[PDB]
Design a protein around this nucleic acid. Structure first.
Lengths: 124, 155, 128, 66, 252
RNA sequence: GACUCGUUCAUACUACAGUGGCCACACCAGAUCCCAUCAGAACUCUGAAGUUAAGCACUGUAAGGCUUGGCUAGUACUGAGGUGGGAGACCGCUCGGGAACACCAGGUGAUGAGUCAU
RNA sequence: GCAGAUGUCCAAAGACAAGCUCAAAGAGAACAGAAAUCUCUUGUAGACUAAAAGGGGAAAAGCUUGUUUGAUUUCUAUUU
RNA sequence: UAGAGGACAGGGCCUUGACCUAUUCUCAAACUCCCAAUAGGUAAAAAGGGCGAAAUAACUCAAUUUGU
RNA sequence: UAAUAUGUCUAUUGUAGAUUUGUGCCCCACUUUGCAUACAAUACCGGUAAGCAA
């Protein structure tokens, strides 16, 4: 009995879609935001985003506190302003669904859907 | 004008419904011995060692055994005579025959029945009965149970 | 089962049925011919005696046309050495004639081929 | 003029004229290219019996011929 | 549109059970259970080393059509007898289990006298051939410990040195087979802080031993083990569904 | 009681409620290395404070669905015979063989060997 | 006779291993749109697999990555 | 060939479509969930089988004595 | 360059196999011999590979 919402991942969305001379500045501002290196979009080169975890997740959350219609239904929220925001959360025990022992899948009620998302959004 | 290796095998080599996918785990776990009757059934999931155009569903003796392949002696009819042919196929395309299990239990029956019959000195035959005419017996059909039916007209 | 199945494929070219005792006796006595010669050299010969029957079957204690009828009607342990020993009967055409060789004995229209069952005794003794 | 392109007529009748022959079913088949390193071992097996049989027979022959 | 329609549902398939619960890979599985067909009765007895969340497992699997039979499964909780009560998932624990299976099956064969083995760290060997273990290994893993303990007992397994200390480091081999890579963490945390020591090294301090005692107990135990070992039926379902429909006639 | 080596390839799997560890899963928190990963996310490894929350072990849902039995139906179709019918296609007849597309119900089996515990 | 295809192409589009799952649809997201990018759900392949067509393929035979030259020499039993 | 009803777009609560769920009429040499009849193949014991010992091997197996 | 190879005037080995020998001068089963021939197994000769090569 440890039903609670924890934190696993968090990404961004830095998408412009043009030529060079600005990937450097985008990666530089993204590194100053989160110290770690972003990666690109499709390469058929038009977008980029970065991830980092730890207390830096809480720090970027606190930065990103600043509509009530378009919530995500799996605790994986995202938005944007130039910058964007993305964060992946869900209930624990999630790793048996991805571990080499018993790669498996989730049930339904144990997911928190979007009502819990809206409740947690107003609570935070 | 077209006589390729897999010509005319659209349905013969096609995988059956619900049967798609590689062979089962213990299909590789059959004790094949030399001089063993065996059916050769193509498995299109495995491409190497595929049996050739005509020998799908045939049966033959094992004359060769290799690390992952089997040589099968299959008689094929051409023109005016049947001639032997040695086909070398991988073991997923080979299924143990069900011709000799008809006599395996018969030959176990022999060692337990003929032995006791001779040692007690009776004469008993063992040939298959090929039963035709049914014997004569005394029966009891019940007058209550007997019921009548009849044919029907047009409608 | 085996011979009945193999005869069903040839039914439209034959007529067959129950022989009964008097008819088998007539066939053996007046049309019975026997292979007296040596293996594969049989040299068809009419019975006319029991010496050849004893020579081929006396060690097997079924010597005599008495025994051959006694054995052919009720199919006892020796049918191999009786049927195969007996030459194929060469029958005369029917005295009164066939009805229709082209049609089955069982169709409502007149016909001949098929299983006459018990009705073949009259045909045999008419053809004999 | 046009030629008869193909027909299978009379072919199996010609076949059954002399009948559908069968393989002669020899008891032993050559294994010239059949699983090497195993029948080589069988070859080595045979000599083991051969040598003892030959020496025993030769000794018996000499002892009986004096 | 619905993809869950009945025409779709009438075409589904299923997976197979051993991979479906995750013990064999079902491609490595086929590759290990296949052997050359010229070798009849070549049992291919496979040595298996696996890691639980608590201990280490070493087994023998003798291939059969119906299923494999283990002469005995090597246990890391029997090391309590030899001198490892707790710490049964360590590198030294896996090495002890490898020596366990090796020496205990050797005495099952009555061939300890024929193959004594080797002392400490530097006819024909005993049957073993490795299992995949599903996972992806890394250098200096505890999967090596069972294999190397088995080798020191007399066993042999062809197995590459990619996952070996030095990608050849006998010093790291010594640091490994006695598990002292926990002792290095212990020394580093001593100089770092004592805040997490209560939650991390609890039973260790209960046992009242040290870094230089981990190696001592492990070596003593390894020497000791080297020298000596509910349902509802048709009518019930009908009655219950009748009750359910009768109830929902007026329930909601 | 638990697991293990394996199995049988759906009674072994897809839409909802109920139970959960003395020893056994699985969840654990973390990155210092053997070390491997945008990221200790997977993986490795560290030790066990909090957990059955999960998957799942199982139960059950007139669900899916596995499947067979009956019914379709001696219907469709078809081997052999016909100096059979019919202007033809078709349609009988004799000796034989003989399907497929909807519904009611069974519940989601079982395998040897070993260890720990009781 | 009918619908077509071949005289090519590939140091990888060959070999091995690992990881991942594809098409599509729906719901969302600064610039940003029917579509360009990201997240989630469903997703038996409805994608992809050099080419014509037909088979086969989902911890794959597809995508990505790493290492590679077994696209090497010689000889058998053979199938079309 | 057509529907029962129904949360997206367009026009003026209404309309037009698109789309959806279980349904309807009719078809496929190069379409199959299923699937005959006929045709085809293999097996029907002695130069063989079963059952044990002994040997032999440079093969196989941890095995100069496991198996073949 | 050139067909067992000097341990021996037993003259390669098997499975079938014609004939011969007896025992239970003519039926039968066991041993005794093993033509021809067939299917194989072996060696040895010439050539080519592979290993070594003064």
């Amino acid at each position: 009995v440890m039903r609670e919402i924890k934190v696993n991942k968090l990404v961004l969305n830095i998408c412009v879609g043009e030529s060079g001379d600005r990937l450097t500045r985008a990666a530089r501002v993204l590194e100053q935001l989160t110290e770690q290196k972003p990666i690109f979009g499709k390469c058929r080169k038009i977008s980029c985003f970065v991830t980092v975890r730890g207390k830096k997740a809480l720090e970027i959350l606190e930065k990103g506190l600043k509509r009530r219609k378009n919530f995500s239904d799996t605790g994986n929220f995202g938005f944007g302003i130039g910058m964007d925001f993305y964060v992946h959360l869900s209930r624990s025990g999630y790793r048996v669904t991805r571990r080499t022992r018993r790669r498996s899948k989730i049930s339904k009620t144990h997911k928190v859907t979007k009502e819990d998302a809206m409740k947690w959004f107003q609570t935070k | 004008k077209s006589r390729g290796k897999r010509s005319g095998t659209r349905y013969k080599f096609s995988k059956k419904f619900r049967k798609h996918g590689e062979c089962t785990a213990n299909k590789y776990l059959e004790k094949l011995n030399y001089g063993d009757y065996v059916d050769i059934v193509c498995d299109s999931t495995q491409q190497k060692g595929m049996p050739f155009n005509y020998y799908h569903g045939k049966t033959g003796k094992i004359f060769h055994i290799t690390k992952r392949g089997v040589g099968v002696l299959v008689n094929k009819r051409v023109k005016h005579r049947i001639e032997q042919k040695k086909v070398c196929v991988r073991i997923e395309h080979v299924r143990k025959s069900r011709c000799n299990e008809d006599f395996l239990l018969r030959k176990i029956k022999n060692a337990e029945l003929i032995k006791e019959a001779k040692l007690k000195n009776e004469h008993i035959n063992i040939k298959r009965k090929t039963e035709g005419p049914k014997p004569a017996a005394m029966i009891k059909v019940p007058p209550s149970k007997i019921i009548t039916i009849e044919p029907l007209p047009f409608y | 089962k085996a011979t009945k199945e193999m005869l069903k494929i040839v039914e439209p070219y034959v007529t067959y049925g129950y022989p009964t005792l008097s008819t088998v006796r007539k066939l053996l006595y007046k049309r019975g011919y026997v292979r007296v010669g040596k293996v594969r050299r049989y040299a068809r010969k009419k019975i006319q005696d029991n010496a050849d029957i004893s020579k081929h079957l006396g060690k097997y204690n079924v010597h005599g046309i008495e025994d051959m009828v006694y054995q052919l009607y009720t199919c006892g342990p020796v049918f191999k050495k009786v049927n195969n020993f007996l030459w194929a009967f060469k029958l005369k055409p029917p005295r009164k004639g066939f009805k229709a060789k082209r049609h089955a004995f069982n169709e409502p229209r007149p016909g001949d081929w098929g299983n006459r069952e018990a009705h073949i005794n009259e045909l045999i003794n008419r053809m004999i | 003029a046009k030629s008869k392109n193909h027909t299978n007529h009379n072919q199996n009748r010609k076949a059954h004229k002399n009948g559908i022959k069968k393989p002669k079913k020899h008891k032993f088949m050559s294994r010239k290219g059949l699983d090497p390193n195993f029948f080589r071992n069988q070859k080595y097996c045979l000599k083991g019996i051969q040598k003892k049989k030959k020496e025993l027979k030769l000794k018996a022959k000499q002892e009986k011929n004096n | 549109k619905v993809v869950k329609n009945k025409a779709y549902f009438k075409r589904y398939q299923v997976k197979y059970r051993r991979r479906r619960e995750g013990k064999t890979d079902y491609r490595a599985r086929k590759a290990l259970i296949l052997q050359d067909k010229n070798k009849y009765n070549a049992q291919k007895l496979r040595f298996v080393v696996r890691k639980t969340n608590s201990q280490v497992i070493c087994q023998i699997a003798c291939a059969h059509i119906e299923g494999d039979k283990i002469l005995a499964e090597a246990k890391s909780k029997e090391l309590i007898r030899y001198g490892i009560p707790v710490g049964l998932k360590n590198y030294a624990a896996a090495y002890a289990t490898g020596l366990l299976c090796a020496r205990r099956f050797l005495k099952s064969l009555n061939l300890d006298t024929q193959f004594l083995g080797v002392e400490k760290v530097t006819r024909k060997p005993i049957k073993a051939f490795l299992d995949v273990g599903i996972t992806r290994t890394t250098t200096g893993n505890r999967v090596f410990a069972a294999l190397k303990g088995a080798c020191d007992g007399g066993l042999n397994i062809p197995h590459g040195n990619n996952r070996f200390p030095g990608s050849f480091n006998p010093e790291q081999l010594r640091k490994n087979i006695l598990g002292i890579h926990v002792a290095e963490y212990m020394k580093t945390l001593q100089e770092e802080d004592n805040d997490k020591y209560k939650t991390h090294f609890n039973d260790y301090l209960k046992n009242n031993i040290g870094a230089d005692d981990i190696e001592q107990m492990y070596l003593n135990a390894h020497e000791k083990i080297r020298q000596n070992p509910k349902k509802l039926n048709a009518k019930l379902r009908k009655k219950r569904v009748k009750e359910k429909l009768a109830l929902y006639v007026e329930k909601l």
